[PDB]
Amino acid sequence: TLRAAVFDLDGVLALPAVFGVLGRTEEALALPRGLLNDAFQKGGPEGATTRLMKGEITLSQWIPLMEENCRKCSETAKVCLPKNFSIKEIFDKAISARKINRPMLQAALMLRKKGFTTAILTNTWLDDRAERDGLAQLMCELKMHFDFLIESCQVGMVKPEPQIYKFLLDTLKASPSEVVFLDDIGANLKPARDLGMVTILVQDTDTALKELEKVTGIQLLNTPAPLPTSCNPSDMSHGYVTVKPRVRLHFVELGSGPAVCLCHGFPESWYSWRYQIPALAQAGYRVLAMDMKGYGESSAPPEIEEYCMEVLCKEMVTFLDKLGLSQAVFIGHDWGGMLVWYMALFYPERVRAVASLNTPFIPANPNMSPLESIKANPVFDYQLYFQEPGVAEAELEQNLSRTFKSLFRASDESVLSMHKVCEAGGLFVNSPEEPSLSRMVTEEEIQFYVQQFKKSGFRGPLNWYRNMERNWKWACKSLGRKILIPALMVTAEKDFVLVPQMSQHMEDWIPHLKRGHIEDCGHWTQMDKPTEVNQILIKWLDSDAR
Amino acid sequence: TLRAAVFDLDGVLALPAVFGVLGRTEEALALPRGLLNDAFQKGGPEGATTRLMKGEITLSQWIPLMEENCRKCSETAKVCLPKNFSIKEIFDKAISARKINRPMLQAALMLRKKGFTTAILTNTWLDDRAERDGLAQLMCELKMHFDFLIESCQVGMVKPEPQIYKFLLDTLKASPSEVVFLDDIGANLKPARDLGMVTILVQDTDTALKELEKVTGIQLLNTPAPLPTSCNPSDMSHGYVTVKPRVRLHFVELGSGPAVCLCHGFPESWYSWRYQIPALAQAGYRVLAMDMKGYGESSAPPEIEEYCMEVLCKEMVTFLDKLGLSQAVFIGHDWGGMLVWYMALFYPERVRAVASLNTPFIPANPNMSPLESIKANPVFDYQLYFQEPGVAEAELEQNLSRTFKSLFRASDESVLSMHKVCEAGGLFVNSPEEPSLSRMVTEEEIQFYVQQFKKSGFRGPLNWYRNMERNWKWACKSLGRKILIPALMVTAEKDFVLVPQMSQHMEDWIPHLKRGHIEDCGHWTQMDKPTEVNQILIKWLDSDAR
Ligand SMILES: O=C(NC[C@H]1COc2ccccc2O1)c1ccc2c(c1)N(Cc1cccc(Cl)c1)C(=O)CS2
Ligand SMILES: O=C(NC[C@H]1COc2ccccc2O1)c1ccc2c(c1)N(Cc1cccc(Cl)c1)C(=O)CS2
């Protein structure tokens, strides 16, 4: 019975294989067959390549030793090398062309999901080239998906030496019969088989995956499209900034590059962006996923005034000041989407770009109170139930597991009546006390929001709805302005409160506005349609946020 | 008696003044005198400019309204504007050319240092231009040096309206007689005087500073070169990363741009880099100032093995992995300098560039034990006193205020005998129990290290010296390698343990090595010579770290 899966890098988890380049270069240069390959592994276990793979020497030290081997190999075939020839130039293109083998990673991901201990066992070098970052980015992306990464240059052992295999078994804490081993080199595959491990010679991915699916008894090939990588809270970098004597902001941070500040809605968390954080960091951005004031590890002062848009926006400006950020792109959902449009209206110099999920930008009516305006549309009736301090808190805090299971549901899973919330007298009137688990979330994920909301409850979050007159008066100062910095509006087809139709006149205030629309998507955009959210934002960031 | 100082931005804290550009453009274009200036403030308190300054409209909305005013002003002088003319193009150059008025900032810095409440009162706009970042960077640098920043567009009031002055007094919580007011515009200066405030018409900086020095009774002009901006711990962004079940790393983070990871020595803190963090962030880098394992808010497991170079280097690689950083430039001092050379030797793909302050790179002698090697040089005798667990801890932890006051001293302030530490029997044998305060530190700064060291004491820090055999064996694996990635060696003239001479053969292992040397500098490089450290690193980062 199998319990662990081992994968080589070059030719297995990454294609095209770097080995293949030595050969296709000889074909491209009408050079003798296997000339560059023979020069490569010249000397065997005593040769320059073995020393490089054991970590005795770095890649830049090996480059000249290899050129001398290429010199000698052409000398013993009675032929000569070209003028515009460089080993450095060949390997540079070879390493750069080498991309992740997505289906092979998907299969590794599925095996780990089903309880398998996963590992990478590769013959590699200490890369000190000026362009080593490309490969560093590849390894950093891959490694985080496996329990272990064993590198020949870090262990001073190499494939096919039997010591590295015994080392692999010891680190895996498993017997050979419990191990599947994938390699594109038969010679390197042999000792694993010889030790009693299950082996798969990887030539083409599809066949190798057929072999793997058969031996594990797990469907890996033709399996449904997987969800984007999520976040394990305890594996994240957690950031803390004091924005004023009693107010501290918490955020999760991942990646390098232009700063992207993610702003959640009500009643959410930084965790509501869990499927976006790895995707955006991977796309070349420095993601700062906030716990908005009143939420999670952020301060939650009791006073209503602490939650008016003006103070929330000022504190986010302070957040940037203390972190030393002149700008960040602001991406908001629900209440965060409202904040984000006001960040763009009142502080354009601090906003590189602005994007909103579901929340439209509707200017204030100076000729009507926001409380009268709410009346006009019975969809917002629940907001009047939220006005009285303590009322909604008591109902929402009473059973947290019930609160989040009832709320976080797809468009076809509705369990709550948000209409006539005033009349029925309560948000959970004819709602199950123990609702079913939505297809959007796991029990573990709901339990994350439960633990988060145990610190300060619903007062701070509900206070965001308790400053409509303040916000209205404040918004009225911007009634002569336009949003002229890059902007994106993302509509969700099946959001029954923030309906796409509410965004229709936005172009009158944001003329160069870009759009995105998500079919069959509910209010909880990020968890309902993660793949498409990431696709829309990554595409917009690369075109509009540099 | 004076207690507050107020400064305008344009023409006061930032030069050349943007006003001046309208006029020198007319001269450059042989246009009628004051044409562009008259078109600028056309309409008075009802005009386009007033609306922009009150925040009714953004800069991009004002640009076309201004072009129409330029149209009408040329029409009433019977002349015509050029072909290659653009108001946008003029203001862009004007805002970009405008730099901080360093002596004026220095004077503001000195006034705040002497108990003055400081503030900026400017007539400004909501900048939504594609190039608004330049100005955002200017304001973000400046604002952090003042208690308050009052912007006309944020307050909906403007200079010279008397309401803004009464607003300024209320925010300053001071009476007019307690306020000095600096402005380059007489009209805007007038109401402050009219209210009873002390005023200074700023034409040239020197004269204005003479006027200011006279009225405050504080030397501001010709004053000594100031220390670089430091860090207030409670105003920093604090980061926390779990690198393994029982090990968490803490860091302070500031700025955007290429990641620069700062690694302190023994017995230090992230705070030891306090004069570098704002300087490097300001130079366009994302500074991550570490609390190294065993220090401050970072984990301090008791076991000696947890502090061998191999594990410390592996954990820093994990630190990068969890933060989503493919690389960072590694800058180390003392023990951090040792780590940093081993980061470059064992993980070149993760090191964009490496720099060491004082610590040279000396390869391991495979033919001699590091304990024998230590014997050979009696300068390292204190390291043998550090070997026995508990001994040095008891002495160093006994009086923390005494430990740091005795240690953190300039080259001419020596209070300790590090020679024959073995014989005398103790590190503090003939040392004062209450040493004088070094000219390098304040009581407040020593008290920071005291509070930091109260959490886990000296075991973890001293454990860094307790793995010489492990480190020696590990280092010996790199004996065939070279450091070929960008590298900087910074020597300190008066470091009596890490003498410049120890770095002499480094070029044999680091051929493209760059150097820096600091005259009259002790061991505590960062606090001894902050200005020159920042100058050497900023210059090296811009040439070698992109
Ligand atoms: O309140 C919401 N949005 C916040 C701001 C954004 O700016 C606005 C701009 C325009 C209008 C309103 C604006 O309100 C909101 C939005 C959509 C939905 C929704 C709530 N609810 C109700 C709910 C949610 C959580 C807990 C409870 Cl008890 C009840 C759903 O369950 C899913 S649909
Ligand atoms: O130990 C030091 N360096 C760490 C590594 C770096 O890698 C190395 C590479 C080569 C040699 C040694 C290496 O050692 C060190 C260095 C300089 C000085 C110094 C200590 N001391 C002694 C001291 C400091 C703190 C507390 C106490 Cl009780 C005593 C001073 O007071 C100022 S001069």
Swiss-Prot record, chains A, B:
Residues 234-546 are annotated as: Epoxide hydrolase. A lipid is attached at C521 (S-(15-deoxy-Delta12,14-prostaglandin J2-9-yl)cysteine). GO terms for cellular component: cytosol; extracellular exosome; peroxisomal matrix; peroxisome. SUPFAM superfamilies: alpha/beta-Hydrolases, HAD-like. It is found in: Cytoplasm; Peroxisome. Induction: By compounds that cause peroxisome proliferation such as clofibrate, tiadenol and fenofibrate. The modification Phosphoserine is found at S369. Signal peptide: none annotated. This is Bifunctional epoxide hydrolase 2. The modification N6-acetyllysine is found at K42, K190, K214. GO terms for biological process: cholesterol homeostasis; dephosphorylation; epoxide metabolic process; phospholipid dephosphorylation; positive regulation of gene expression; regulation of cell growth; regulation of cholesterol metabolic process; response to toxic substance. Residues 1-223 are annotated as: Phosphatase. NCBIfam families: HAD-1A3-hyp (TIGR02247), HAD-SF-IA-v3 (TIGR01509). Mg(2+) binds at D8, D10, D184. The N-terminus is blocked. The covalent modification of cysteine by 15-deoxy-Delta12,14-prostaglandin-J2 is autocatalytic and reversible. It may occur as an alternative to other cysteine modifications, such as S-nitrosylation and S-palmitoylation. Inhibited by 1-(1-acetylpiperidin-4-yl)-3-(4-(trifl uoromethoxy)phenyl)urea (TPAU), 1-cyclohexyl-3-dodecylurea (CDU), 12-(3-adamantan-1-yl-ureido)-dodecanoic acid (AUDA), 1-((3S, 5S, 7S)-adamantan-1-yl)-3-(5-(2-(2-ethoxyethoxy) ethoxy)pentyl)urea (AEPU), N-adamantyl-N[']-cyclohexyl urea (ACU), 4-(((1S, 4S)-4-(3-((3S, 5S, 7S)-adamantan-1-yl) ureido)cyclohexyl)oxy)benzoic acid (c-AUCB), 4-(((1R, 4R)-4-(3-((3S, 5S, 7S)-adamantan-1-yl)ureido)cyclohexyl)oxy)benzoic acid (t-AUCB), 4-(((1R, 4R)-4-(3-(4(trifluoromethoxy)phenyl)ureido)cyclohexyl)oxy)benzoic acid (t-TAUCB) and to a lesser extent by 8-(3-((3S, 5S, 7S)-adamantan-1-yl)ureido) octanoic acid (AUOA). Its cofactor is Mg(2+). The keyword Zinc-finger does not apply. Bifunctional enzyme. The C-terminal domain has epoxide hydrolase activity and acts on epoxides (alkene oxides, oxiranes) and arene oxides. Plays a role in xenobiotic metabolism by degrading potentially toxic epoxides. Also determines steady-state levels of physiological mediators. Changing E469G: No effect on phosphatase activity and epoxyde hydrolase activity. Phosphate binds at T122, N123. It catalyses: an epoxide + H2O = an ethanediol; (9S,10S)-10-hydroxy-9-(phosphooxy)octadecanoate + H2O = (9S,10S)-9,10-dihydroxyoctadecanoate + phosphate; 12-phosphooxy-(9Z)-octadecenoate + H2O = 12-hydroxy-(9Z)-octadecenoate + phosphate; 12-phosphooxy-(9E)-octadecenoate + H2O = 12-hydroxy-(9E)-octadecenoate + phosphate. The keyword Amino-acid biosynthesis does not apply. The modification N6-succinyllysine is found at K54, K420, K454.
